[PDB]
Amino acid sequence: NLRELRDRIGSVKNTQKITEAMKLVAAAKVRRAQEAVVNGRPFSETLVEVLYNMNEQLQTEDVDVPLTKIRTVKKVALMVVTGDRGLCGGFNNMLLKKAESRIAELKKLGVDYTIISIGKKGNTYFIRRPEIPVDRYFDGTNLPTAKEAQAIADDVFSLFVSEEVDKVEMLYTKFVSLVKSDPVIHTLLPLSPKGEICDINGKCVDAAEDELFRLTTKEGKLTVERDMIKTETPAFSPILEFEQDPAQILDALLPLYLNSQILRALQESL
Amino acid sequence: LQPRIVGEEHYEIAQRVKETLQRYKELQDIIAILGLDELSEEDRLTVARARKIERFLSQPFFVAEVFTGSPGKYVGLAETIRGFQLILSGELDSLPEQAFYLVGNIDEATAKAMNLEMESKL
Amino acid sequence: LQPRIVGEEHYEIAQRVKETLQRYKELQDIIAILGLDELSEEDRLTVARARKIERFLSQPFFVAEVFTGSPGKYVGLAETIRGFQLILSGELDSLPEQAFYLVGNIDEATAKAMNLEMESKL
Amino acid sequence: MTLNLCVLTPNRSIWNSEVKEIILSTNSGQIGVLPNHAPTATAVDIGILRIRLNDQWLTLALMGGFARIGNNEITILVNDAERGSDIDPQEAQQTLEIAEANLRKAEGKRQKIEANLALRRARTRVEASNT
Amino acid sequence: VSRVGSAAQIKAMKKVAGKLKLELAQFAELEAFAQFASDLDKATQNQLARGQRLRELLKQPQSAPLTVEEQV
Amino acid sequence: VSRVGSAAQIKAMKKVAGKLKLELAQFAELEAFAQFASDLDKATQNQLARGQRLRELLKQPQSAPLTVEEQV
Numbered sequence: 001n002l003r004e005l006r007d008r009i010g011s012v013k014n015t016q017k018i019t020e021a022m023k024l025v026a027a028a029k030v031r032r033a034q035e036a037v038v039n040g041r042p043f044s045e046t047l048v049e050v051l052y053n054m055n056e057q058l059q060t061e062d063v064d065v066p067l068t069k070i071r072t073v074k075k076v077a078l079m080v081v082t083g084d085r086g087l088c089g090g091f092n093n094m095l096l097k098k099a100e101s102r103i104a105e106l107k108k109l110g111v112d113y114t115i116i117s118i119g120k121k122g123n124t125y126f127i128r129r130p131e132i133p134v135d136r137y138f139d140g141t142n143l144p145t146a147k148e149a150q151a152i153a154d155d156v157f158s159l160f161v162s163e164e165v166d167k168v169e170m171l172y173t174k175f176v177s178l179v180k181s182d183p184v185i186h187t188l189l190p191l192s193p194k195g196e197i198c199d200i201n202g203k204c205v206d207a208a209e210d211e212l213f214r215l216t217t218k219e220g221k222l223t224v225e226r227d228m229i230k231t232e233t234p235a236f237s238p239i240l241e242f243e244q245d246p247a248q249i250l251d252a253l254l255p256l257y258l259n260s261q262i263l264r265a266l267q268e269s270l
Numbered sequence: 271l272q273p274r275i276v277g278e279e280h281y282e283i284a285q286r287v288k289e290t291l292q293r294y295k296e297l298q299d300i301i302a303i304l305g306l307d308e309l310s311e312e313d314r315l316t317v318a319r320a321r322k323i324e325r326f327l328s329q330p331f332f333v334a335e336v337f338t339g340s341p342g343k344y345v346g347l348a349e350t351i352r353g354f355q356l357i358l359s360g361e362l363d364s365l366p367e368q369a370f371y372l373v374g375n376i377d378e379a380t381a382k383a384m385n386l387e388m389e390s391k392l
Numbered sequence: 393l394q395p396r397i398v399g400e401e402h403y404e405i406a407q408r409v410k411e412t413l414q415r416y417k418e419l420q421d422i423i424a425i426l427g428l429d430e431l432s433e434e435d436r437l438t439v440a441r442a443r444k445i446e447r448f449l450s451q452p453f454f455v456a457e458v459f460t461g462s463p464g465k466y467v468g469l470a471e472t473i474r475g476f477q478l479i480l481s482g483e484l485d486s487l488p489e490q491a492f493y494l495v496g497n498i499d500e501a502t503a504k505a506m507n508l509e510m511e512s513k514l
Numbered sequence: 515m516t517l518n519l520c521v522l523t524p525n526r527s528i529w530n531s532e533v534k535e536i537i538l539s540t541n542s543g544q545i546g547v548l549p550n551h552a553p554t555a556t557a558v559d560i561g562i563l564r565i566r567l568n569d570q571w572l573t574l575a576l577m578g579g580f581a582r583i584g585n586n587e588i589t590i591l592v593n594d595a596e597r598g599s600d601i602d603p604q605e606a607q608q609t610l611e612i613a614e615a616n617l618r619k620a621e622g623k624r625q626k627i628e629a630n631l632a633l634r635r636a637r638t639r640v641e642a643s644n645t
Numbered sequence: 646v647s648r649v650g651s652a653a654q655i656k657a658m659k660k661v662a663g664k665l666k667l668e669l670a671q672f673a674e675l676e677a678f679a680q681f682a683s684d685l686d687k688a689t690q691n692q693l694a695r696g697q698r699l700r701e702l703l704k705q706p707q708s709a710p711l712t713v714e715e716q717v
Numbered sequence: 718v719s720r721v722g723s724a725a726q727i728k729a730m731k732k733v734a735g736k737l738k739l740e741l742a743q744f745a746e747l748e749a750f751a752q753f754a755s756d757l758d759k760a761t762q763n764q765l766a767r768g769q770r771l772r773e774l775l776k777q778p779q780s781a782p783l784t785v786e787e788q789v
Contacts, residue, residue, distance in 0.1 A: 039525060
C-alpha cells in the first residue's frame, strides 16, 4: 500500500532528524566535558608542582607513606569505569571485553582479582555474571564532581590501605579519538612517590607533563587532538618552613593526588 | 463532542486523552529505534500514561464473553470520565499496566491491581 | 559546464566556488557549536571566502531599479570570472563583507569597500 | 596591601576573592594567617576554615589536603570544600546522624577506616553550618 | 502557501506578521531539539521557549474569529 | 559483467589486467570501514593509497581512446 510506504518514509525521516539532534547534543556535551577538564587544571597543575617539590626536598630513606607503600601483590583490585547508557557504539562492549582480558590475565598469574564497577552498563554486566567478586557497585554520573569521585576514593583508599588488595589499577578509555577510543588500564595504587603515573604494561609518563584533549575541526570534519603542555614546577622557597613533618605533610598530599587522578579517569571516560 | 453539547468537563478530558495518545503515536517510531531511555521525564510520563490509557479503553462485553472469557461490564459516562480523569491526573501512576486491560470501571482496575500484587508476592 | 566547453580557466573557478560554497554549508552546523575562532586557520578562511562569494553572487538588476532605486549592473562573463579569482585567491581578504553585496563588477565591490571605509571614518 | 587567597578543589576553584585574614585548621591543630606571613607549607586537616576579610568572617568546611602560603599569597589544595552558609544545617546534621549510626555498626579493618573517615567528614559539615 | 502573500495583508499586519513568520520558521527547524532543550545555550533555548508560546497564539476555539486589531 | 570476459582480451591484457581486477576488489572493501578503523596501518593504508591511484588510471578524457599497448 502507498499509504503504508509513505508512513514508513515519514518515520524514517523523523528518525533521521532525531538521531541528528542527538548527535549534535552529544557533541555539545563533549565540549562541555572538555571545559570541565580545563576547570580542574589549576588544581592538577598546582598539585604536581607541590608533589614534585615535596619529593625533591624529602630525599629520605626513613619516610614511608601508606598509599605509596608497596606490599606483595597477592591480590589486585580493578575498577571499571564504563558508560552510563547505551547507544554509544562499542564503547561499553569494548571496555568489558578489555576488562575480561585483565581478569583472564590475572588467572594466569592467579592473584585474585576484584572489581569495583562504575556506571550502569558495567553494573548490569557484573550483576548478571556472579562468577566474579565485586567490591562495590557505584552509580554512574554525568557531570562528575569531586563529591562523586570522593565516594570512589573513600572506597579505594580505604580498601588499599588495608593489605587485602594491592596494586589497584583502573581501566577506562582515554579520549584519544572520536572514531576510536581504546580502553587503557593504569595502575592507580600504590601512588608513585615520584608522582609518575604509569600504565600496567610499563610505560610511565612524568606527571609534570600531561595533555588535555581539545576538540577542533580538521578540514571539514570534526576531530580531536590531544596536546600536552608541560607544567614547570618552580623551586620551593629557600626559607620555606614545613608545618608538620615532610613525611607527614606528604602523607596528607597523596590522597589529594589520588582523588585528583580518579576524577580525571572518570571525566575522561565520560 | 463539542463543549456546548457534552459539557466542558467531559470535553477537556476527551481532548486531553487524545493529546496523550497522539504524543505516544508520534514517539513510537523514536522509542523503538532509540529506546525508552532517550525520552525526557515528561515524554516518559506521557508514554507511561498513554500506555495505561490505551489499555483502559478496552472493555469486556456481554457479547464477547466467549471471546474474552471474563464477564462483560457496562460502564456509564460518569464512570468513564471519573476513571479517565484519575489516569490523566497521575494518581494511578504507581499501578501496573495490566491492571487496566479489560476492566469495566476504574474501581475494577484498582481491584485488579491489588490482585496482581497479591499474586506477585506469592 | 565542462572544461572542453567553457574553457579551462572558467571551469576551475566554478568548481572551486562550488567547493568553497559547499564547505561553508557543511561548516554551518560546526560553526554554531565551535564558533569561528575555534575553527582551524584554513576554515576561518573558507568560511570568510564563502561569505564573500555568497554576497558577490547577488547582483543589482535593471528591472528592480523602480523598486529598490539602486542601478542595475549587466556583468560580463569575463568580469564574473575575474571577480571570483580575486576572492578565491585571497587578494581581497581584507575587505568587509558588505562591499560584495549587490555590486556588479569586481571593481565595484572594491570601490564600495573604500567608500564604506571613508564613511566609517567620518 | 593584603595577602590573597585561592582555595581550589579538583574540579572547581571556589574562593578567589582576596582577604585580610584567614584562620585554618591543620594536622598540628590550628594556625592563623596574617598579611606578609613568612613562607610556610601546612598539610591541612579536614575540618572548618574561618576567613576574615573586612567586616565579615565566615566558615567554609573543607575536606583536607595541603595549604602552602607564599609571599603575599595563600593557595589551598583541598579535595572537597563547601561554604558553611550554603549547606543547610539541619540536613547536614541528619547526614551526621546517619554516618554515626553506620559507624556504630561498621566493623572490620578497612570498613571502620571508611566509617571513621566518613563520620569525621560528616561532623565537620555542621560545624561550618552552625558557625 | 499563499501566492498573493503580503500584498493581501494590511500595512499594520505586515509589520507584525513578518517577525512572526521568522520566529515560527526557527521553531520548525528546532522541533527535534525540543526533547533536548536543557542541553542548549540561551539563544537556542529562548527560541524554543518563544516558539512554543508563538504556537499558542495561533490556537482558537471554534467560531471565535478575532478582529484584525485582536490579531495585531 | 562481461559474459565473454577474457576469451575477449589479448594475452598481454589478460596477464596485465589480472592484477588490476583483484586490486579494485581489495579496494572496494578497504574503502569500506576506512573511516571506521580510522588509524590506518600500512597493510591497509598502502593498499588504500594504491587504490586511489588505481582509480586515477581508470580516469580518461572524452574522445581520447587509448591504444592497446598504452592500456597494457
